[PDB]
Design a protein around this ligand. Sequence first.
Ligand SMILES: [Zn+2]
Ligand SMILES: [Zn+2]
Ligand SMILES: [Zn+2]
Length: 87
Amino acid sequence: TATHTCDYAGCGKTYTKSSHLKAHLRTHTGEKPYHCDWDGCGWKFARSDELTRHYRKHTGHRPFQCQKCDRAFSRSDHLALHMKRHF
DNA sequence: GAGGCGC
DNA sequence: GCGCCTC
Ligand SMILES: [Zn+2]
Ligand SMILES: [Zn+2]
Ligand SMILES: [Zn+2]
């Protein structure tokens, strides 16, 4: 369905319309060209990795699974601090 | 938990 | 993207 891809560095966001890709491309500007697109958020980042990491707060994606319990985290550093509970 | 950023 | 500071 989505065939219109942003080719900006580290982005890859795809759109169903040329209309939408066009207006998205306008956001890649300034000191922080990685704008979170979550409704009402408004955060902006200098680096793509920072946006990717941030955006898990909105989706609840938690790929860092504790091997000693059923808890999971959005970030490696959070998992590493958690693991101290198993000492 | 989440943002900044050196690596 | 991890790991460390910082808030
Ligand atoms: Zn883009
Ligand atoms: Zn956001
Ligand atoms: Zn655990």
